[PDB]
Symmetry: C3
Subunit: 181 residues, 3 copies
């Protein structure tokens, strides 16, 4: 059975033997990353012929977020369990994409508001959910030692979603939504 | 008029006469369940011919979540108002569905990542929003006496969404997304 | 480049020179409004021929939310920077719409559950995300002086989404979902 009922009184296991309340900042950080992952899965379900080029990298992002969640669930001083996530190559990978997408899209002009195509709009939602997860990761960091690589990546990731959102609009010839002064 | 403006200074009524700030953990718990309910409504709007079998139980879940919200809004020591939600039959009902859906879907293999069809992806989002509500319910529980039946149900409910998500993928012959080691 | 990396250690700038941790209630309030804005962009991407009448006002709401976010990011005692958002005309504008939509839709009957058409369901999600942002705005208010006009507007805005959701259902001849006693 997938249900143990062990969590019925509001406590849960993390990586290692530690049992925490589900409102613990560590469990919250893990959960926000999990919710982001689910949103990314939802976003990739909206891909069409015009935007198929985005499918692979979204899948890779889900893989990377699973690793982020693992590390958030891992106490830094746990002898038996260690961090698995390293920021350097995934973050440089994001930066390459941010750079590429930023140059191909039209120069603006005004501040950009979230929206456009359904996919671009979803990528904008991904941006804001990433930022929500980031806040909770910072909450955890202020109480416990974390894998700081996760925070670097999650910071960069919301810029990725912004750039990818603009690019998704561009791919369907949809103008970005702009703030009118 | 649906607006009283009574809430314009950030306070609000619960069940009974009590007035709380909108950031009170009780109001937050109620609100997270309400947001879950809205997400379930959104999810059921995505049902197609292949997945029509899921419509009725999602509607029943919305009914049950309304009852959960009521009880979260009810102080335990309120003489005039009492809990209405009982976990036993709804939770056994969920468990029956979890069991059925778990056996019909393919055995894996790897850890499952959220995604697949738009409906399955939405059900995965429902899973994570349920867990977010659960954390806030636990926050409330740590400060105030709650209807513990609500927590049992909400715990089980996220397993329901996981199982139903896999089942929704299965119903459209879509493989579950898997974590690559 | 859109990424400075200045935020990689979990701190960020607001309006003016102040640097805050990303989990600061002010940054959280700003972020929740931003997430609402993205959800509104997503919602407006779902508009069809039957509901095109809702497009313009949703766009105006995104403009207004950008102004709300600005003011939430502005300390009240900052000499160099001031509040830009005034509630009176936008809120009266919402109230006019709430009144109109409330009278055209069928009288009920039972408590309304969120759902119906995909757009109506999305507008119901907008309602709950607005309320989530409202809670965080109240959290900030309890620690710092805020532009209280933002809170008035955000309070009213969730009633707008409720009314607009019902109206969106009505526009496609879809009955509201009702709670069965
Ligand atoms: N509400 C939640 N939010 C975020 N993370 C959670 C939540 N509940 C559990 N977790 C984390 O996700 C993992 C898997 O969740 P699961 O629901 O199986 O655990 P549980 O609730 O403790 O057990 P059960 O549901 O079987 O009673 C947990 O081991 C814990 O690390
Ligand atoms: N932001 C919120 N988040 C979660 N729950 C809320 C929120 N605001 C109100 N509630 C709860 O939902 C109920 C209905 O909300 P409603 O918006 O009508 O109340 P209000 O804001 O106090 O009044 P008004 O909007 O008429 O000024 C409230 O009585 C309260 O229990
Ligand atoms: N996680 C977050 N949640 C909500 N608001 C944020 C978050 N991060 C930054 N902000 C706010 O949004 C603005 C723009 O975000 P941005 O990501 O560019 O800032 P940063 O993270 O400090 O810098 P960088 O991403 O370049 O390292 C910030 O100046 C701050 O006001
Ligand atoms: Mg940043
Ligand atoms: Mg559980
Ligand atoms: Mg209100």
């Amino acid at each position: 059975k997938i249900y143990t009922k062990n969590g019925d009184k509001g406590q849960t296991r993390i990586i290692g033997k530690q049992i925490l309340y589900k409102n613990d900042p560590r469990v919250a950080a893990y959960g926000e990353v999990d919710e982001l992952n689910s949103w990314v899965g939802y976003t990739k379900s909206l891909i069409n012929s015009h935007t198929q080029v985005l499918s692979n990298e979204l899948e890779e992002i889900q893989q990377l977020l699973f690793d982020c969640g693992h590390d958030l669930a891992t106490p830094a001083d746990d002898e038996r369990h260690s961090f698995k996530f390293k920021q350097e190559q995934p973050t440089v990978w994001l930066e390459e994409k941010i750079d590429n997408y930023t140059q191909v899209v039209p120069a603006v002009k005004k501040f950009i508001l979230p929206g456009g195509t359904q996919l671009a709009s979803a990528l904008h939602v991904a941006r804001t959910i990433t930022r929500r997860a980031e806040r909770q990761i910072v909450q955890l960091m202020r109480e416990e030692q974390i894998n700081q690589d996760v925070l670097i990546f999650i910071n960069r990731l919301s810029d990725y979603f912004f750039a990818a959102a603009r690019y998704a609009n561009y791919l369907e010839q949809q103008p970005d939504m702009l703030y009118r002064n």
